[PDB]
Amino acid sequence: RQWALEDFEIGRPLGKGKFGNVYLAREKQSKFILALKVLFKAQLEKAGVEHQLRREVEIQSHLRHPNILRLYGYFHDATRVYLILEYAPLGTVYRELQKLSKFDEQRTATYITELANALSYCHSKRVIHRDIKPENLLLGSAGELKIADFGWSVHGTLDYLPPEMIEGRMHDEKVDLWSLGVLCYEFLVGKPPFEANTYQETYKRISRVEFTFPDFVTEGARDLISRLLKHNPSQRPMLREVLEHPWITANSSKP
Ligand SMILES: Nc1nc(Nc2ccc(S(N)(=O)=O)cc2)nn1C(=O)c1c(F)cccc1F
Ligand SMILES: O=C(O)c1cc(-c2cc(F)cc(Cl)c2)nc2ccccc12
Ligand SMILES: [Mg+2]
Numbered sequence: 001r002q003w004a005l006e007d008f009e010i011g012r013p014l015g016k017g018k019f020g021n022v023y024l025a026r027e028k029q030s031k032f033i034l035a036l037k038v039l040f041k042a043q044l045e046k047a048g049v050e051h052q053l054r055r056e057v058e059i060q061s062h063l064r065h066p067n068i069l070r071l072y073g074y075f076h077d078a079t080r081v082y083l084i085l086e087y088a089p090l091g092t093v094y095r096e097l098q099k100l101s102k103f104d105e106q107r108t109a110t111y112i113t114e115l116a117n118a119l120s121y122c123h124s125k126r127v128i129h130r131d132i133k134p135e136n137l138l139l140g141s142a143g144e145l146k147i148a149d150f151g152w153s154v155h156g157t158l159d160y161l162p163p164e165m166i167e168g169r170m171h172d173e174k175v176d177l178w179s180l181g182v183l184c185y186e187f188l189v190g191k192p193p194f195e196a197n198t199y200q201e202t203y204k205r206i207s208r209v210e211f212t213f214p215d216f217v218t219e220g221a222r223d224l225i226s227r228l229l230k231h232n233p234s235q236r237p238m239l240r241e242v243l244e245h246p247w248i249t250a251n252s253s254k255p
Contacts, residue, residue, distance in 0.1 A: 001073070002075075003073055003074075003075045003082075003084065004075060004077075005075075005077065005082065007027060007028055007029070008025045008026065008027060008028065008036060009025060009026045009028060010023045010024075010025050010036065011023060011024035011025060011026070012024050014035060015092075018043075019039045019040060019043050019044060019047075019049075020037065020038040020039040020040050020043075020080065021037070021038055022035050022036065022037045022038075022085070023035065023036045023038065024036075024087065033087050034072065034084055034085060034086065034087045035084075035085040035086070035087045035088075036082055036083070036084060036085070037082070037083040037085060038080055038081075038082055039053070039080060039081045039082075039083070040079060040080055040081075041076070041078075041079055041080060041081060042079060044081065052152075053081070056150055056151055056152065057071065057074055057083065059127060059151040059154075060151050061073075062125070063121075063122075063125070063127070063151065065117070065118055065121045065122075066140075066144060066146075067114045067115070067117055067118035067144060067145055067146055067147060068118050068121070068122075068146060068147050069085060069086050069088065069138060069146045069147060069148040069149075070085065070086035071083060071084065071085060071086075072084040072085065072086070085148070086146070088138035088139055088140050088141075088146050088148070089139075089140070089141045090138070090139030090140065090141060090143055091138065091139060092134065092135060092137065092138055092139070093111070093134040093137035093138070093139065093145065094133075094134040094135045094137075096139065097134055097186070097187070097190065101190045102187075102188060102189065102190040103187045103188065105188070105218065105221065105247075105251040106251050106252075106253060107187070108184060108187040108188050108221070108251070109247065109248050109250075109251035109252035109253075110251075110252050110253040111137075111145050111183070111187060112180060112183070112184050112187070112224075112242070112248060112252070113243060113248060113252040113253075114144060114145040115132070115137075115145060115147070115180060115183065116180065116239045116242045116243050117243070118145075118147050119176045119180070119239055120239045120240075120243075122151075122176075123173045123176070123239070126154055126173070127151055127153075127154060128152070128153050128154070128155075128171075128173050128175060128176060129147065129150060129151060129152065129176060129179070130150070130152045130153060130161075130165070130171075130175055130176075131150060131152070131160060131161070131179075132147065132160065132176070132179045132180075132183060133157075133159075133160050134183070134186065136148050136149040136150070157199075157202075158194075158199055158202045158203060158206060159182065159192040159194055159195055159202060160179055160182050160183075160192065161175075161178075161206065162174075162175045162178035162179070162206075162233070163178075163206055163207055163209070163231050164233060166203060166206055166207070167207065171233070172233050174233035174234075174236050175233070176239075177228050177233075177236035177237065177239070177242070178228065178229060178233075178236065180228055180242065181193075181224075181225050181228025181229040182194075182229070184221065184224060184225050184228065185211070185225050185229075188216075188217055188221055189213075189214060189217065193211035193212075193225075193229070194206045194210070194211060208231075209229055209230070209231050211229065213225075218247075220245075220246060220247025220250070220251075221247055223245075223247065224242070224245050224247050224248065228242070
């Protein structure tokens with residue numbers, strides 16, 4: 001408890017968003033390596049998010065799972081707000097997708113497994129993430145996936161939102177299964193299935209569930225993805241079925 005900036009040595013930048021940056025940092029007392037997201041109050045005000053940020057910080061501080069990024073604590077000063085985060089040494093799934101273009105089936109299935117675990121734990125707490133992008137997935141030091149950033153509700157680009165959300169209607173914990181499908185596709189294909197040059201058209205493509213597989217996408221992967229990317233949230237499987245999908249169990253690296 002009770003942390004101030006004078007308690008940390010700052011290091012190189014690890015990333016930069018529209019509300020301040022993440023830095024590598026060390027805790028002076030214990031020599032703990034961590035990340036330090038710095039957000040600017042002046043800018044958090046002008047967007048009107050001080051409340052949503054508090055609600056998300058509140059939600060994250062109670063979450064412990066090896067595939068969810070810890071929030072250790074937080075504090076603030078005259079102009080800024082600081083989140084103390086688990087440092088993930090192997091960087092973003094985004095950068096690793098740019099490096100390799102596509103992932104194979106073992107890596108995809110393994111990531112999808114770790115994601116579903118993290119989401120199942122999330123739903124047990126009745127928590128929905130509502131936005132899982134490769135930008136927001138980090139790699140721990142054994143390359144294990146870690147969901148970062150947000151945890152929006154209990155109740156930017158459109159590529160990852162399900163149709164109920166973009167149409168306005170109400171949305172179960174089932175929005176997370178659409179996202180799993182979008183990622184499973186993006187991991188194997190190298191781009192998300194509703195990508196498009198403009199927002200308004202990604203909208204149409206999402207709305208009507210208009211995607212096509214390249215030739216290399218195997219049968220088992222076509223099945224999982226297709227059973228996740230259903231317009232009626234009613235029809236998406238439970239994460240139990242995902243984790244026991246034959247394509248997953250055959251390709252997912254063993255526990
Ligand atoms: N908490 C956390 N750890 C990391 N680690 C990390 C390690 C290496 C690199 S790299 N290859 O040098 O660009 C990048 C990140 N990021 N991180 C963040 O919250 C974080 C994030 F979620 C998204 C984007 C940037 C971040 F900074
Ligand atoms: O009124 C303040 O002092 C102020 C505080 C905070 C804040 C403090 C926390 F301990 C945790 C979190 Cl998540 C946010 N956020 C702000 C955003 C805009 C403007 C002012 C603030
Ligand atoms: Mg206030």
